[PDB]
Amino acid sequence: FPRVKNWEVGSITYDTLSAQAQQDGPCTPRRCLGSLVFPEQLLSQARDFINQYYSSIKRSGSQAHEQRLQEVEAEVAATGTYQLRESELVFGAKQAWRNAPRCVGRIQWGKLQVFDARDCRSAQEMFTYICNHIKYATNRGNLRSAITVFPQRCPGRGDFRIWNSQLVRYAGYRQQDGSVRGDPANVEITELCIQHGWTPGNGRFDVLPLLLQAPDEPPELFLLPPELVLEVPLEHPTLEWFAALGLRWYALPAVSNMLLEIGGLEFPAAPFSGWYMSTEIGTRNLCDPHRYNILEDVAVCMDLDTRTTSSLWKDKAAVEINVAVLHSYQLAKVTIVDHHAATASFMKHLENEQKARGGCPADWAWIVPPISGSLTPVFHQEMVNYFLSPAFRYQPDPW
Amino acid sequence: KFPRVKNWEVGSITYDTLSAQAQQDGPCTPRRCLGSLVFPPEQLLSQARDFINQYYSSIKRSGSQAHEQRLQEVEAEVAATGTYQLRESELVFGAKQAWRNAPRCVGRIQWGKLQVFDARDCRSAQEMFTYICNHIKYATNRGNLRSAITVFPQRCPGRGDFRIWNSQLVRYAGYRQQDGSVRGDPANVEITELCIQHGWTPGNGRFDVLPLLLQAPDEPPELFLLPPELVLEVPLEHPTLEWFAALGLRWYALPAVSNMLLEIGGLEFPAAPFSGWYMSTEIGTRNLCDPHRYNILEDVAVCMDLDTRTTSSLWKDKAAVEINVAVLHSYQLAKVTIVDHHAATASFMKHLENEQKARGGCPADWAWIVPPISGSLTPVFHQEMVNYFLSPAFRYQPDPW
Ligand code: HEC
Numbered sequence: 001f002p003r004v005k006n007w008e009v010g011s012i013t014y015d016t017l018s019a020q021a022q023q024d025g026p027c028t029p030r031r032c033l034g035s036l037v038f039p040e041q042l043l044s045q046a047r048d049f050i051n052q053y054y055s056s057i058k059r060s061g062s063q064a065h066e067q068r069l070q071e072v073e074a075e076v077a078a079t080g081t082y083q084l085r086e087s088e089l090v091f092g093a094k095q096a097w098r099n100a101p102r103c104v105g106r107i108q109w110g111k112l113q114v115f116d117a118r119d120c121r122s123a124q125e126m127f128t129y130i131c132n133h134i135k136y137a138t139n140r141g142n143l144r145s146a147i148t149v150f151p152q153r154c155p156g157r158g159d160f161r162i163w164n165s166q167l168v169r170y171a172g173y174r175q176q177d178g179s180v181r182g183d184p185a186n187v188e189i190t191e192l193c194i195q196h197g198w199t200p201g202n203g204r205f206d207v208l209p210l211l212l213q214a215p216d217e218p219p220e221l222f223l224l225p226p227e228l229v230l231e232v233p234l235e236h237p238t239l240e241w242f243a244a245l246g247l248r249w250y251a252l253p254a255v256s257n258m259l260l261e262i263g264g265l266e267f268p269a270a271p272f273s274g275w276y277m278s279t280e281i282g283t284r285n286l287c288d289p290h291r292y293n294i295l296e297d298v299a300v301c302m303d304l305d306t307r308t309t310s311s312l313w314k315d316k317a318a319v320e321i322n323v324a325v326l327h328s329y330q331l332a333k334v335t336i337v338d339h340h341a342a343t344a345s346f347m348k349h350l351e352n353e354q355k356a357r358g359g360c361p362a363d364w365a366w367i368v369p370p371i372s373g374s375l376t377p378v379f380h381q382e383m384v385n386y387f388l389s390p391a392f393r394y395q396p397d398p399w
Numbered sequence: 400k401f402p403r404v405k406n407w408e409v410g411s412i413t414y415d416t417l418s419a420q421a422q423q424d425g426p427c428t429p430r431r432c433l434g435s436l437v438f439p440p441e442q443l444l445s446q447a448r449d450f451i452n453q454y455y456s457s458i459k460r461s462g463s464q465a466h467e468q469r470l471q472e473v474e475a476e477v478a479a480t481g482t483y484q485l486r487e488s489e490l491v492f493g494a495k496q497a498w499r500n501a502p503r504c505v506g507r508i509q510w511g512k513l514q515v516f517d518a519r520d521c522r523s524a525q526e527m528f529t530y531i532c533n534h535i536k537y538a539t540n541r542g543n544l545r546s547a548i549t550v551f552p553q554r555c556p557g558r559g560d561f562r563i564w565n566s567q568l569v570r571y572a573g574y575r576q577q578d579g580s581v582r583g584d585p586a587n588v589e590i591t592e593l594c595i596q597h598g599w600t601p602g603n604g605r606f607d608v609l610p611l612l613l614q615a616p617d618e619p620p621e622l623f624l625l626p627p628e629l630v631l632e633v634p635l636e637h638p639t640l641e642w643f644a645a646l647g648l649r650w651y652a653l654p655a656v657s658n659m660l661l662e663i664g665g666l667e668f669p670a671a672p673f674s675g676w677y678m679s680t681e682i683g684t685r686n687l688c689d690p691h692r693y694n695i696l697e698d699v700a701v702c703m704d705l706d707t708r709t710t711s712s713l714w715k716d717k718a719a720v721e722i723n724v725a726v727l728h729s730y731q732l733a734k735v736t737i738v739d740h741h742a743a744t745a746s747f748m749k750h751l752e753n754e755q756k757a758r759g760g761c762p763a764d765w766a767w768i769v770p771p772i773s774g775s776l777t778p779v780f781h782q783e784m785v786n787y788f789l790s791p792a793f794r795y796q797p798d799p800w
């Protein structure tokens with residue numbers, strides 16, 4: 001049993017949950033790879049998922065429990081798979097999020113709105129489902145967490161897939177001169193949409209159309225009514241010239257390319273969303289050199305000295321950009337949380353989870369924010385990373 | 400299958416074939432990763448043979464008569480005495496590899512330029528103290544810092560070891576004031592009290608240099624005071640925030656780890672202090688802003704007149720940044736060697752590139768290589784890393800008391 005210690009406070013504990021890890025990770029006693037970004041087995045996984053559920057409603061070992069088990073086994077034996085019950089799906093989704101090692105916002109895992117789109121039959125339907133999801137979750141600015149689950153993977157049938165990595169993202173157009181107008185991170189998907197019949201725009205913040213895929217069909221292009229896509233223009237509380245830079249970002253962070261795994265079942269298409277932690281926008285999206293890379297320009301405008309790295313001109317500009325994002329989102333009344341408030345809440349989460357399950361899978365490298373790391377509580381907290389199921393998983397691109 | 404390491408900023412890829420030769424076992428298992436944990440006879444001969452081979456391989460004389468004789472020579476020494484002795488040329492080589500192999504060190508581009516002082520002829524605590532003072536002088540060099548390490552007698556069978564009780568040659572005392580608080584560096588409360596328990600008459604300042612507690616084999620630790628003219632220090636001041644200087648903050652110039660164990664070819668050296676120079680973030684961010692350290696963030700944010708009422712104003716980020724600026728400013732001003740996290744991380748990327756060509760890999764601890772503030776603004780954040788343990792190495796050992 002792994003001993004876990006917090007070095008700021010000094011307290012220690014023992015991750016007894018780690019022992020129950022479902023799948024295997026990349027690390028071996030020979031070398032750690034924690035910093036890398038990336039039939040009888042169906043039944044076993046399914047039986048375990050059923051157990052977690054009946055344990056979640058304090059009905060473990062009941063008649064209902066045993067029948068549910070026999071029913072799933074009967075189904076698998078006959079169709080090679082089985083269908084979950086509504087209550088199970090809801091419970092599963094929450095656990096997947098609960099078990100996400102890289103999500104710093106898990107204090108909220110119990111408040112998740114689940115939309116059941118398992119009856120979805122076409123791309124056009126997928127779109128209608130997605131738009132309702134976006135409307136509900138955006139909720140005019142007071143964001144609400146939600147996930148929409150589409151049909152599960154099937155024996156003898158293609159999968160449902162959303163080609164985009166997010167429900168909302170800006171286009172990236174490779175200019176001739178090697179530069180990129182828009183989000184460099186989205187050049188491939190931007191080109192795929194064009195390849196499929198979309199005439200592009202030419203702005204830096206063009207919301208990309210959706211490339212939705214129904215089983216064994218080519219993907220279909222859909223355009224999100226702008227009315228549905230809430231955005232925040234970025235301004236600074238005192239640096240007046242910032243507003244004039246014409247920057248902005250969308251309110252809804254919605255991952256749509258991961259797979260949801262519950263009791264041996266896989267949902268290649270189950271988009272989930274919540275709200276942003278300011279650093280993601282202020283630091284990663286706007287400052288990564290391979291993203292919008294605005295750090296230098298901002299500094300020049302801040303009339304800072306960029307000749308020497310030791311002046312810490314970079315840290316200065318980044319900090320002000322993060323302030324603008326926070327200021328701006330609060331101004332537009334759109335949910336957002338800073339890295340301090342978020343990390344503090346996560347320390348609370350670890351505590352609850354210790355009492356609840358005796359541990360909590362966590363990825364130190366992803367929990368610590370991209371700036372002011374040691375200024376946040378999690379930086380001084382040891383963590384154990386392991387894979388538990390239900391879970392959200394990465395999967396290859398459909399193309 | 401060799402691990403695939405990718406840089407996400409550039410997209411470049413390499414394979415770490417050097418990790419398959421990992422000498423020690425790490426904490427992780429395929430069941431769970433413990434990467435973030437701070438503390439993770441024939442066996443000797445197999446470690447000595449490997450070291451000797453590394454050595455002859457380094458002077459490109461592997462497989463020569465001199466090589467074979469050196470192997471046979473250490474085997475006989477072990478058969479006869481249960482241990483063996485290194486030659487000066489080997490000790491030097493070993494200490495360097497030990498630095499080169501340290502996963503948590505971002506200043507590794509400089510590994511080949513380590514100056515090794517052989518104090519294996521040390522006979523007492525008094526001599527240790529002399530060697531340490533010399534090291535400090537040579538290394539401090541009036542502000543133009545030089546990397547060095549002084550190796551004291553190796554651990555012996557049927558005999559106690561040499562040990563320097565302090566975790567560092569230069570540290571500030573920590574006095575637990577009556578009311579909970581701590582005057583000085585909270586981190587050195589225990590070592591401070593041990594110096595007192597052993598006859599030290601304390602001070603009452605915030606930056607009181609601690610005396611050294613040196614241990615000779617089978618001897619209670621003797622106490623020694625460092626000549627003030629030896630301990631070079633830096634008064635901290637900000638370049639534009641004139642009130643900073645008035646906070647009377649300061650830090651020493653010499654970063655010297657003295658409580659780690661140096662291992663070479665199965666041989667262990669419980670005492671072998673080493674030093675180089677600081678990376679700004681270590682002083683301004685960790686030592687001065689850690690809540691369990693000098694924890695001065697609020698006092699500064701206040702003097703900066705920032706709204707500390709709400710976290711969302713990032714007042715902590717602003718205060719910290721300025722403090723780091725002050726550290727850099729003060730050191731550059733005082734002509735004391737120092738490097739910021741942008742340059743340090745940038746050079747480390749060069750080191751990764753050098754090592755990939757030299758050994759087909761580099762053991763790196765991502766969580767320690769990434770600076771405490773402004774992580775993703777430095778190039779190491781976007782670099783995947785593989786962590787493993789190669790020997791020679793600097794290791795942690797339990798406190799002598
Ligand atoms: C309640 C608001 C909320 C906040 C704030 C939040 N999350 Fe996450 N989150 C994840 C998963 C899965 C990952 C790992 C994703 C990855 O590697 O990008 C993640 C990762 C993250 C990360 C780090 C990954 C990155 O790209 O930097 C942050 C920060 C984060 N979540 C913040 C599933 C969720 C779900 C699913 C039902 C919900 C709701 C959710 N997350 C809600 C939230």
Ligand code: HEC
Nearest residue numbers: 498501503504505506509546548673674675676677678793
């Ligand atoms: C050339 C100047 C130089 C710089 C700058 C430097 N080092 Fe290190 N360094 C280490 C070891 C060993 C560790 C891991 C130590 C630990 O966990 O305390 C380390 C860790 C570090 C760390 C991270 C640990 C922390 O406390 O935050 C930094 C930053 C660092 N070194 C900077 C041995 C060395 C040696 C030994 C011959 C030399 C010389 C050395 N280091 C020279 C340098």
Ligand SMILES: CCC[C@H]1COc2ccsc2C(=N)N1
Nearest residue numbers: 253255272273274275276277
């Ligand atoms: C660009 C999307 C990354 C996203 C990870 O996933 C979620 C899901 C809900 S909020 C959230 C988040 N803060 N960042």
Ligand SMILES: CCC[C@H]1COc2ccsc2C(=N)N1
Nearest residue numbers: 654656673674675676677678
């Ligand atoms: C408080 C000392 C930690 C020390 C780690 O060890 C070395 C050794 C030479 S410089 C250096 C350093 N930058 N920090």
Ligand SMILES: [Cl-]
Nearest residue numbers: 253280281285
């Ligand atoms: Cl994003």
Ligand SMILES: [Cl-]
Nearest residue numbers: 654681682686
């Ligand atoms: Cl220090």
Ligand SMILES: [Zn+2]
Nearest residue numbers: 027032427432
């Ligand atoms: Zn690991």
